[PDB]
């Protein structure tokens, strides 16, 4: 009850990480396709994917904090 | 208006007959019905523009 | 026995003034009244008929007379409470043959092993290969036919909930209001929200279904 | 702005003015062509070419065909075939063009007669939509 | 009466000729009509020229040349990508409608 | 563009139907002008 | 039953930060691929993309109070 | 087991809300690229953009009135 | 075990809605991507997409009505 | 363990009707986006729509099946 | 626990025709606003469609083949 | 419990094929609006959708040995 | 219970995978795209895809990691 409820919690919080992860090739794609329209790359546009990658990823470490929460 | 006022009169009766609780779902549809009075006017000047002049053009 | 007795003439007669309303209404009076009246199928014949015929003439004003008492008919179910939890889910299972019954018409009553014949011979289900054919006749009839009985009461539940979840917010917190006054402005707002869009939504997919039966008919 | 460059062997209304935008029937749709706008080149279509000019206004207009052409740069150059202002074309002769349009095309011989009515009749709306 | 120097010796390799040259002064729509027939032929870019008198002033012109880019080819090569979009179609639907525009134009000249 | 260019028709064929659509359109002061720019000295040869 | 379905259960709450994470890389890349398109950056579009950010991880601190209270 | 699997069942339904979240930055994402291509910003197209986030968080108060009533 | 997973059954059938909540913002995400590209929009577009809204809320009337016969 | 983990069992074989309902939209999307273009509507691309909407539909019935075979 | 949680595994399992029906929709979604660029129906587009909606329900019966091995 | 939740857990590794069976969706899909922009329909594009249908299969039968690992 | 709940908990983060197999799609996809829009292949935007595949399959490291974890 005690000891292992917390291990069927930090599972199913881990299934949070489902969208950094296609949120990424989302924002990745966009850029990717968004380059090819051209021609603002080594700025502007490129440096707008990387404040994209991280507020996706800012699901997947508040979603990660919690799977290490329920473990340790 | 007479024939919306009719048409209020038997739901009201309906509502009489087939009443669960009396209170909170009176507050839901009474809100309901507040909403209407306001909103209804200005959409009564529309319903007006509308038809006794598609009357008369037909 | 009275009870339910009741209920089926009521919802027959508020759609019967209108339409036998109508037909008076060409030559005499008008008056206020007739002139009143009138626009009702004047709202019908001007809001549906822009995506009728399509189909043509002869099946438009057959279909439209259903259309219009699914709609008129969930609005009975709106204001009276209680109604929806019990009144309402035996009116979806009530109207349920008719939704049933209304592609027998055409499309099983004619052809009952390949009614897709009538309905959409290629498209959807594939004319190239008879198996899909009489899979996808479940996805386009057997199923939507269930469906559309699901459609009615899916605003059956969510108009059910305002009501519950209402009742319930001011029984947990009977403080008169006060703080479920916060809840329950958003329940009633929610009416609107869900039944008044949902509603129309319902006797819309009653519109575009019997359209792709009887237009490729 | 783009020096928008709006012409017509009728007109050249703009003429490389500096233009924030003009809404321009492409062939698929359209687009309202922002201020100095990428290459691109597009081929018209008839619709309405609305020149917002920078300036707060936006002119109507009215175009059949041509090509506007999207510069890297600031110049965008419809060249539009046919590019007329409104006040110049009839409704009510699009109208009642287009009500012949519509009973032409039933007698239209093949996509091109069709196109043509089409090119017409959707030409009569295209300017119909504006006019 | 420029087939003259260029008629003695084809006859065939002319494509069209425009008569009422001038006359009621020539225009646009001519410009298309000339145009759109024109396409039809089994030359495109081997590159075309198109030789008038562009002028300077009423009286001096200078017999001109301009050269027709009738590729839709390596002008579908190139820096024309940038036209980010833009078809062989629409291209040619330019090159097409730009060979009235000139047409015109050059006619005029 | 397979409302005209279907087969054929030339942006040019299109065009000039579009154009000539326009000639076909127009108001009335203005509906004199519009024959002037269109193909009317037009006399093809190829002589 | 009481200490182990409640610690069972705020790990099921946390798939609701799946929908965040992706949806916060679909409204992140449009203003990639709609800046790609040009030119309105500053101010418009990308000043949207915060109105279009709140609306999306609005469910998702709607699903980090459900999680936290299970939690505490 | 009839107070307990109230607990995780209501987060099982809180799972509900990431297609409330997900749909939202898919709602507002095709409005950024939208009004990209332009020019009706007020009025037509994020009137449009209105009455499509209120039917796509719709599934997320309906799957909130669903997890509130396991727990309350 | 009867009543116990009634509750832990109508839960999981809940998380369902999720389906209908993006699929309703893809919907009309495209129609907000579609009279962008003007101009049918009157009839045609946004009558096309009343039946892809009810196509999509055709599987919320399917999944709510499930975890509401597990429920009464 | 025989009538309990039945209800259990029914309820995520309902969560496999949440592909179709996204499938619905992304389906009947791509044709809200396509007659756009034009002018194919009731021809070709609303007719491939119809065995676009059957295809996703059919992986609702194959799972709804899955959810009625655990129910009776 | 034997006789029981195989009834609730093979719910898990049909949670993987999320994917098959979902991928259905972006694919017979792609060949419908693909096809509204014309003019190749036949013999190219709609016959890789054959091919797209084959590596799609592939992982549906091997999702729908995960069911059936914990039922038979 | 011990033979109990093996069966659980192969299932719930099996609902992790529903990100690659719409990952060759979306893969194959952009590859059918792909080939319509013309006209490299052999190689460059159709040749990259075996190298594109290849990392996101790579996740299904990672996903697919961690469901029979619980099995074997 | 606690040999138990281990093999419940291990492949409940396998779902976490969904997002890195949906995320490798949609990365790809949109390099298909944007290669169909030309010209950089080599480099520029091929090479972005590499960088795009590490950004999403990085939360699909990070979730196989917590099931291994709850494995071994």
Request: charged share 15%; glycine share 6%; aromatic share 10%.
């Given at each position: 009850?005690?000891?292992?409820?917390?291990?069927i919690?930090?599972?199913?919080a881990?299934?949070?990480?489902?969208?950094?992860?296609?949120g990424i090739?989302?924002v990745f794609?966009?850029?990717?396709i968004?380059?090819?329209?051209?021609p603002?790359?080594?700025?502007?546009?490129?440096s707008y994917?990387?404040?994209?990658f991280?507020?996706?990823?800012?699901?997947?470490?508040?979603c990660?904090m919690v799977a290490?929460?329920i473990?340790? | 208006p007479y024939?919306?006022?009719?048409?209020?009169?038997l739901?009201?009766?309906?509502?009489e007959?087939?009443?669960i609780?009396?209170?909170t779902?009176?507050?839901?549809?009474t809100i309901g019905f507040?909403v209407?009075?306001?909103?209804?006017y200005?959409?009564?000047?529309?319903?007006?523009?509308?038809?006794?002049?598609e009357?008369?053009?037909? | 026995i009275?009870?339910?007795?009741?209920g089926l003439p009521?919802?027959?007669l508020?759609?019967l003034f209108?339409?036998?309303l109508?037909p008076?209404?060409?030559?005499?009076?008008?008056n206020?009244?007739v002139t009143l009246q009138?626009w009702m199928?004047?709202?019908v014949?001007?809001?549906?008929?822009?995506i009728?015929?399509?189909?043509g003439?002869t099946?438009?004003?057959?279909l439209?007379?259903?259309?219009?008492?699914?709609?008129?008919?969930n609005?009975?179910?709106?204001?009276?409470?209680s109604?929806?939890?019990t009144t309402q889910?035996?009116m979806?299972?009530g109207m349920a043959?008719?939704?049933?019954?209304?592609?027998?018409?055409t499309?099983?009553?004619?052809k009952?092993?390949?009614?897709?014949?009538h309905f959409?011979?290629?498209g959807?289900?594939?004319?190239?290969?008879?198996?899909?054919v009489?899979?996808?006749?479940?996805?386009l009839?057997?199923?939507?036919?269930?469906?559309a009985v699901?459609?009615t009461?899916?605003?059956?539940?969510?108009?059910?909930?305002?009501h519950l979840i209402?009742?319930?917010?001011?029984?947990?917190?009977?403080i008169?209001?006060?703080?479920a006054?916060?809840?329950?402005?958003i329940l009633?707002?929610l009416?609107?929200l869900?039944?008044?869009?949902?509603?129309?939504?319902?006797?819309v997919?009653?519109?575009?279904?019997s359209?792709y039966?009887?237009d490729?008919? | 702005?783009?020096?928008?460059?709006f012409?017509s062997?009728?007109?050249?209304?703009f003429?490389?003015?500096?233009?924030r935008?003009?809404?321009?029937?492409?062939?698929?749709?359209?687009?309202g062509?922002?201020?100095?706008?990428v290459?691109?080149?597009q081929?018209?279509?008839?619709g309405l070419?609305?020149?917002?000019?920078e300036?707060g206004?936006?002119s109507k207009?009215?175009?059949?065909s041509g090509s506007?052409?999207?510069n890297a740069?600031?110049?965008?150059q419809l060249?539009?075939?046919?590019?007329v202002?409104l006040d110049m074309?009839?409704?009510?002769a699009?109208?009642?063009?287009?009500?012949?349009?519509?009973?032409?095309?039933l007698?239209?011989?093949?996509?091109?007669?069709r196109?043509?009515?089409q090119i017409?009749?959707?030409?009569?709306?295209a300017?119909?939509k504006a006019? | 009466?420029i087939?003259?120097?260029?008629?003695?010796?084809?006859?065939?390799?002319?494509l069209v000729?425009?008569?009422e040259v001038?006359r009621?002064p020539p225009?646009?729509?001519?410009?298309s009509?000339?145009?759109?027939?024109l396409?039809?032929s089994?030359?495109?870019f081997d590159?075309?020229?198109?030789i008038?008198?562009?002028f300077?002033?009423?009286?001096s012109?200078?017999?001109?040349?301009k050269?027709?880019?009738?590729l839709?080819?390596?002008?579908?090569?190139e820096?024309?990508?940038?036209?980010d979009?833009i078809?062989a179609?629409?291209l040619?639907?330019?090159?097409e409608?730009?060979?009235?525009?000139?047409?015109?134009?050059?006619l005029?000249e | 563009v397979?409302?005209?260019?279907?087969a054929?028709?030339?942006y040019?064929?299109?065009?000039?139907?579009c154009?000539?659509a326009?000639?076909?359109?127009?108001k009335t002061?203005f509906?004199?002008?519009?024959?002037?720019?269109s193909?009317?000295t037009?006399?093809?040869?190829?002589?």
């Amino acid at each position: 009850i005690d000891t292992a409820a917390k291990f069927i919690g930090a599972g199913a919080a881990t299934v949070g990480v489902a969208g950094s992860g296609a949120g990424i090739g989302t924002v990745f794609g966009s850029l990717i396709i968004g380059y090819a329209r051209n021609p603002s790359l080594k700025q502007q546009l490129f440096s707008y994917a990387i404040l994209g990658f991280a507020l996706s990823e800012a699901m997947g470490l508040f979603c990660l904090m919690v799977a290490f929460l329920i473990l340790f | 208006p007479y024939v919306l006022g009719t048409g209020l009169i038997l739901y009201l009766l309906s509502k009489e007959i087939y009443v669960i609780t009396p209170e909170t779902f009176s507050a839901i549809s009474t809100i309901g019905f507040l909403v209407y009075i306001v909103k209804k006017y200005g959409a009564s000047v529309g319903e007006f523009a509308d038809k006794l002049n598609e009357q008369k053009i037909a | 026995i009275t009870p339910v007795i009741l209920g089926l003439p009521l919802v027959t007669l508020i759609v019967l003034f209108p339409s036998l309303l109508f037909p008076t209404s060409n030559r005499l009076v008008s008056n206020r009244f007739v002139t009143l009246q009138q626009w009702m199928l004047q709202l019908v014949s001007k809001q549906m008929m822009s995506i009728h015929n399509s189909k043509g003439q002869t099946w438009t004003l057959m279909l439209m007379s259903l259309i219009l008492f699914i709609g008129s008919t969930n609005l009975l179910g709106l204001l009276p409470h209680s109604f929806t939890p019990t009144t309402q889910l035996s009116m979806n299972l009530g109207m349920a043959i008719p939704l049933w019954a209304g592609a027998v018409i055409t499309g099983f009553r004619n052809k009952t092993k390949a009614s897709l014949a009538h309905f959409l011979p290629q498209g959807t289900p594939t004319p190239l290969i008879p198996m899909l054919v009489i899979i996808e006749t479940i996805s386009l009839f057997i199923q939507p036919m269930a469906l559309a009985v699901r459609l009615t009461a899916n605003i059956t539940a969510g108009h059910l909930l305002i009501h519950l979840i209402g009742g319930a917010t001011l029984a947990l917190m009977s403080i008169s209001t006060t703080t479920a006054l916060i809840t329950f402005t958003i329940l009633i707002l929610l009416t609107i929200l869900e039944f008044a869009v949902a509603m129309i939504q319902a006797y819309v997919f009653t519109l575009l279904v019997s359209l792709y039966l009887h237009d490729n008919t | 702005q783009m020096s928008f460059t709006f012409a017509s062997p009728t007109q050249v209304f703009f003429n490389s003015a500096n233009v924030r935008q003009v809404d321009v029937p492409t062939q698929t749709g359209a687009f309202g062509i922002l201020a100095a706008h990428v290459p691109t080149l597009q081929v018209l279509r008839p619709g309405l070419v609305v020149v917002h000019a920078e300036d707060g206004t936006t002119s109507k207009y009215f175009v059949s065909s041509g090509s506007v052409t999207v510069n890297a740069d600031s110049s965008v150059q419809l060249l539009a075939e046919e590019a007329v202002t409104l006040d110049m074309l009839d409704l009510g002769a699009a109208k009642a063009n287009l009500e012949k349009a519509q009973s032409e095309l039933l007698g239209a011989a093949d996509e091109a007669t069709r196109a043509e009515i089409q090119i017409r009749i959707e030409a009569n709306e295209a300017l119909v939509k504006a006019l | 009466k420029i087939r003259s120097i260029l008629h003695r010796t084809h006859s065939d390799q002319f494509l069209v000729t425009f008569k009422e040259v001038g006359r009621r002064p020539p225009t646009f729509g001519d410009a298309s009509v000339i145009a759109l027939e024109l396409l039809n032929s089994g030359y495109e870019f081997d590159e075309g020229s198109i030789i008038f008198n562009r002028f300077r002033s009423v009286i001096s012109y200078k017999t001109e040349e301009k050269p027709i880019f009738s590729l839709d080819t390596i002008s579908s090569a190139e820096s024309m990508s940038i036209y980010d979009d833009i078809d062989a179609d629409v291209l040619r639907n330019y090159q097409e409608y730009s060979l009235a525009n000139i047409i015109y134009y050059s006619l005029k000249e | 563009v397979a409302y005209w260019r279907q087969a054929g028709l030339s942006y040019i064929r299109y065009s000039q139907i579009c154009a000539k659509a326009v000639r076909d359109a127009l108001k009335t002061e203005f509906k004199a002008n519009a024959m002037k720019t269109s193909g009317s000295t037009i006399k093809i040869v190829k002589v």
